[PDB]
Amino acid sequence: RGSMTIQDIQSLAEAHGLLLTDKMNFNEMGIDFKVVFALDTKGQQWLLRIPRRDGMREQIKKEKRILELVKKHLSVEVPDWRISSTELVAYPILKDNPVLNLDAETYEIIWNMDKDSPKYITSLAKTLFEIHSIPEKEVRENDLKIMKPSDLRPEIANNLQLVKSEIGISEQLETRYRKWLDNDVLWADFTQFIHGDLYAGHVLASKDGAVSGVIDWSTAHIDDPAIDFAGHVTLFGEESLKTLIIEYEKLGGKVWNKLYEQTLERAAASPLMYGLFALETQNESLIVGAKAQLGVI
């Protein structure tokens, strides 16, 4: 970006009680945050998230609350936000690398783990169980979004009609979403605390596939549990999804007979959810990417 120097970053961090070496890497793929991998003067590795624009205070305080809450309930590491202002978010680096990363240029998937690892399935299922176990009372106490079963279909109906109007959508994708909305028996009669964007990019694991951490908690709220399975089906396939649901159930994960079906519809609905995102932001580059996934390109 060249928007700020290492000295500018050292000054920001020092102002929040963090003294940084001049050894820094950048990740500029984030639309909301400039990301920095930094070293403090004791050799501790830090992740800095520096907001790209003003107005993100509510977003940052909410994620802070979410991390404080999930920290009490998960066996795996989550970011420990020791700094959290409108100017800077900072946490010490966690134990393991993400399951995959994206090529800086092309956004090609680079697997850090053997995708076929069954230790990924057993450990991911345990984490899913602990996240989904987080009590509603505690969620309400933290002023987080709570979607009830009866809220889900109205909301997605409104998303469909909005995205069709503003971005456009293929006849085949629109009819799949309409059939999904009318297919009552797919929709669970309970909602649970979910990560809200749980896919391999946000899961930290050893090379053998043992999940040790989960990052990027900004989207966490009470909603359709199937949202937390959707990101698995794309990258790992339907057989792997079946193995995961079974492993989840064995732990006492609350399922229904159509969780499988709902997950596939949720995954097939990524282009609609990206439509929504790209539409709020108003970034023209993002709207064009949306059109492509929605099949109007």
Numbering used by the authors: -2 to 294
What do the paper's sentences say?
ALDH was identified as the rate-limiting enzyme in the AMA pathway based on three experiments: (i) Enzyme activity assay: Despite being more highly expressed than the other two enzymes, ALDH exhibited the lowest enzyme activity. Subsequently, ALDH was crystallized to obtain the protein crystal structure with a resolution of 2.28 Å. Each ALDH monomer was found to comprise three domains: an oligomerization domain, a catalytic domain, and an NAD+-binding domain. The ternary conformation was determined by molecular docking of the substrate glutaraldehyde and cofactor NAD+ with ALDH. Based on the catalytic mechanism of aldehyde dehydrogenase on single-aldehyde substrates, a putative catalytic mechanism of ALDH was proposed: Tyr-88 initiates a nucleophilic attack on the carbonyl group of glutaraldehyde; Subsequently, the hydrogen (H) on the synthesized hemiacetal hydroxyl (OH) is deprotonated. Simultaneously, the hydrogen (H) on the central carbon of the hemiacetal is transferred from the substrate to the carbon of the amide neighbor of the cofactor NAD+; Finally, the ester bond is hydrolyzed, resulting in the formation of glutarates. Our findings indicated that the reaction could not proceed under acidic conditions; and (iv) Key residue validation: When Tyr88 residue was mutated to alanine, its catalytic efficiency was significantly reduced, nearly reaching zero. The high energy potentials of steps 2 and 5 were caused by the suboptimal orientation of IN1 and IN4 toward the cofactor NAD+. Whole-cell conversion of Mu4 produced 9.9 g/L of glutarate, which was 4.0-fold than that produced by wild-type ALDH. Finally, the above mutant sites were combined to generate the mutant Mu5 (ALDHI90C/I212C/N94S/P95N/G210T), capable of producing 13.9 g/L glutarate from 20 g/L glutaraldehyde in 30 h, representing a 5.6-fold improvement over wild-type ALDH. The increase in the catalytic activity of the Mu5 mutant could be explained in three ways: (i) The k cat, K M, and k cat/K M values of Mu5 were 27.9-fold, 1.5-fold, and 51.0-fold compared to the corresponding values for wild-type ALDH.
Subsequently, the pathway involving aromatic aldehyde synthase, monoamine oxidase, and aldehyde dehydrogenase (AMA pathway) is introduced into E. coli Lys5 to produce glutarate from glucose. Module I contained two enzymes for converting lysine to glutaraldehyde, while Module II contained the last enzyme for converting glutaraldehyde to glutarate. In this study, an aldehyde dehydrogenase, ALDH, was isolated from K. pneumoniae to demonstrate its double oxidation capability. The simultaneous catalysis of the two aldehyde groups was verified through both experimental and mechanistic calculation methods, providing a enzyme that extends the existing aldehyde dehydrogenase library.
